[PDB]
Structure formats: structure tokens, C-alpha cells
């Protein structure tokens, strides 16, 4: 399948060159450069680009372009997920994937890419097995290696690879037996100029940070399972039992882990937490106008809204803009016509708002619409979906680990028309 991988910055420079089958001429990246040039933004790059003798399938993430090369017919989903997984693993081993993170650790990343992809075929893909084939670049491990000649490369195939549960290494012990679960929900929503509900939904996903020792069998169940539909399930779950018992009985692996994801049925109205008062004036060919926005909580379920940020992409008519925020921070970059306001927190004693005058372009006609309003927000200790856990039983081990769960709602793709 995959012949080679080029890691190219948004700059236009080629940093990490890899090859698996045959030496692909670097000239093939010229086609990517041209296609990038034709588009209006880095974000507009196609994922499938055709060249006279190669195909390029690309991912965009974290200001780095990952272009691979293919010469045979391969399903696009396969390549796109393998590339997104190499990105994810880079995040896991280095916090994030950046040209600095790559170039600072060239040898380890080349070894990693060698281990993962073999002749363009998947060899090692699971997180935990990759953790034991090559160790993370821990500085204490580095000084230990320098002292004793110890190696970052293992010499024994981890037993989990040949086990009936290939997703977790066996024989892991911790003195601090504990496990954390994270149910995060996002409110996808479109709101019109009238404040009505255009289309909204809740996207929910369960994360699980597990620090259990031994071979535990964890069970996750919920008070209100009927609210769960179209639920996702990692290989670690036993699908048959969920279909029969409606129970999440499973063997979680080590380390950070995304457990299941879900959406909320459209049958139940999505509780929109935040409303807005909004007003902008655009007189035709006028040099100045007015801007008025007022953020308000509509259904907070009695909980505070925090971490609020409002971003607007102003039209070309805008030159500068004279406003005063009631709180947070007011920032405006005239080059990209981007209106960013850090709102932060909402106090019931006074609703935060942003108002003032807009320094427009004289002689420039009024834009045909007001750019829509996107807003970020976070609610702690509250899941708008109303999903609740039932119990967390354990089997196969004797300890009683620290058990806890959180419910944090973070704003989804929340956009307000105006």
C-alpha cells in the first residue's frame, strides 16, 4: 500500500523524509505545493490529489501536512486512518505533533515509523504494544541508558501481542490502584438570526484513564441506558453482552484511552445553554458603524458557564473597530479581519457583553450579511445529555481501586447566525 511518507510544514519545506519500498523523488512534492497554491487557504487542500505517476493522500492537523504516496489501488479510508494514527501516536509520545517536536527527536521518530509501517502494511498499531516495543523518550530513561548502555528498543515480544486480548500488556502492577472515567459531551447547534433552534445535537464520548494492576474486568452501566443510541464501541468491549445485557463489561488497557462515544437522539430537545443578543450596523459606503453583542445563559441547569470565547470573521469592509468589553479580553487583528473576544465567565449579577463602533472602509458597500457567531463554553459537573452511570464493578482482582467519574460538557460546533 503505502510507499513513503513526506512530512511537510505549512511553510513549504520538507523536514522528515521516509521511504519503505522505493526511493520516491522529492519532486513529487511539487504537485502538492502547486495544489496548495491554487487553493485559498491551507485548510482547502484536497485529500486525494492525482499526479502523472503517483497518488497523494493527505491529512491536515496541527499545522503539519502529512502527504503519503501510493502506486496501487488502496481504500482511501485505510490510508487516511493510518496517517491520523501516526499523528495520534506522535501526540502520545511527545505531547503533540510539531515540526519542533519532530526535528528535536529525529532518531526516535524514524525508529517509530519503521516499527509501525512495514512495506506499506500495518505491523504495529495498538498504543500499548508500541509502548513496549520502543520506550517513550523519558529523560531519566535517557540518563539510565547513557549510564548502563541500556536500550530504548525492547528484546522480547510483549506477551499481550500473542494474548487473546492484544490491546494490553500482561503483568502490569501499580501500588496506587485507581481508575478514572471521563464522559465529555459537545453541543452541536445552529442558531438563526431570530435565536430559534436550527439544528442541534449532543456528541458524547467516554474517556478512561486506567491505572489498575493485574487483569481486571471492569463493568460500566448507566441509570438511563435508553438515552444512549448509535453508540460506538472499542474492540475492548464485548458487543454481544452490550446487545443482551446493555452493560459495558470489558478489559480496559493501560494508559490514556477513549472508551466509547455516543450521540443523543433527536427525539429529546437539546438543552441549549447560552443565548445571545446581537446587533451590527452596516450603512452603505459609510466609514463607521456599530457593533453590539450580549452573551446570555438560557438553560444552564443551574450551573455556571465558564471558558467563554467568541470569534467572528469580519468582512473585508472592516478596517478597525472600537469596542469595550464588559470582561475578559478584546482582541482584533485587522490583517485577517478576525474579531476575537475572550468572555470567560458569566455572572448572574451582570451579563457580559461587547459593544462599540466599527471603523469600516469608506466607499465600500455594506456586506450582504453579518458573519455568523461562534462561541465556546464549558460547563463542569453537568452533562446536558442527562446520562448517568449506574455502577462500576470489578472482577478477577481482589483490590478495591479508587473509583471516580466526571461529567464535563464542552461546547460543540456552536454557531449563531446573524
Amino acid at each position: 500500500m503505502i510507499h513513503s511518507l513526506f512530512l511537510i510544514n505549512c511553510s513549504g519545506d520538507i523536514f522528515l523524509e521516509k521511504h519503505w519500498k522505493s526511493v520516491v523523488s522529492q519532486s513529487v512534492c511539487d504537485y502538492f505545493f502547486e495544489a496548495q497554491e491554487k487553493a485559498a487557504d491551507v485548510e482547502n487542500v484536497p485529500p486525494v490529489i492525482s499526479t502523472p505517476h503517483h497518488y497523494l493522500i493527505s491529512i491536515y492537523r496541527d499545522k503539519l501536512f502529512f502527504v503519503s504516496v501510493i502506486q496501487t489501488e488502496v481504500p482511501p479510508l485505510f490510508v487516511i486512518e493510518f496517517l491520523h494514527r501516526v499523528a495520534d501516536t506522535f501526540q502520545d509520545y511527545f505531547g503533540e505533533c510539531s515540526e519542533a517536536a519532530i526535528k528535536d527527536n529525529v532518531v526516535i521518530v524514524y525508529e517509530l515509523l519503521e516499527e509501525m509501517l512495514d512495506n506499506g502494511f500495518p505491523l504495529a498499531t495498538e498504543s500499548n504494544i508500541l509502548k513496549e516495543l520502543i520506550k517513550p523518550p523519558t529523560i531519566l530513561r535517557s540518563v539510565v541508558n547513557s549510564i548502563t548502555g541500556s536500550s530504548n528498543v525492547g528484546d522480547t515480544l510483549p506477551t499481550g501481542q500473542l494474548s487473546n486480548i492484544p490491546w494490553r500488556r500482561a503483568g502490569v502492577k501499580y501500588t496506587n490502584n485507581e481508575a478514572y472515567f471521563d464522559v465529555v459531551e459537545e453541543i452541536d447547534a445552529i442558531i438563526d438570526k431570530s435565536g430559534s433552534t436550527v439544528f442541534a445535537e449532543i456528541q458524547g464520548v467516554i474517556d478512561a484513564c486506567i491505572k489498575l494492576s493485574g487483569m481486571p474486568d471492569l463493568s460500566l452501566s448507566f441509570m438511563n441506558p435508553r438515552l444512549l443510541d448509535d453508540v460506538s464501541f472499542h474492540p475492548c468491549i464485548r458487543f454481544k453482552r452490550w446487545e443482551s445485557e446493555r452493560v459495558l463489561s470489558f478489559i480496559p488497557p493501560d494508559g490514556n484511552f477513549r472508551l466509547i462515544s455516543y450521540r443523543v437522539s433527536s427525539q429529546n430537545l437539546v438543552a441549549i445553554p447560552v443565548y445571545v443578543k446581537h446587533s451590527i450596523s452596516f450603512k452603505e459606503n459609510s466609514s463607521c458603524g456599530r457593533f453590539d453583542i450580549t452573551i446570555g445563559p438560557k438553560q444552564n441547569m443551574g450551573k455556571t458557564i465558564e471558558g467563554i470565547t467568541v470569534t467572528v470573521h469580519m468582512p473585508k469592509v472592516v478596517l478597525n473597530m472600537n469596542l469595550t468589553p464588559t470582561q475578559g479580553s478584546y482582541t482584533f487583528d485587522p490583517v485577517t479581519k478576525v474579531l476575537t473576544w475572550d468572555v470567560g465567565k458569566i455572572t448572574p449579577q451582570k451579563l457580559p457583553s461587547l459593544k462599540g463602533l466599527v471603523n469600516l472602509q469608506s466607499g465600500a458597500p455594506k456586506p450582504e450579511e453579518n458573519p455568523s457567531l461562534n462561541i465556546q463554553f464549558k460547563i463542569q459537573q453537568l452533562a446536558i445529555s442527562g446520562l448517568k452511570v449506574n455502577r462500576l464493578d470489578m472482577y478477577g482482582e481482589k483490590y478495591k481501586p479508587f473509583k471516580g467519574v466526571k461529567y464535563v460538557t464542552k461546547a460543540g460546533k456552536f454557531q449563531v447566525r446573524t
Binding site: 485507581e178 455502577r391 467519574v405
Partner: peptide
Amino acid sequence: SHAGYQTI
């Protein structure tokens, strides 16, 4: 680390 988590 255990802080902030509801008991289960």
C-alpha cells in the same frame, strides 16, 4: 489527582 472526581 483524585480531586475533582465524583465518587462511583
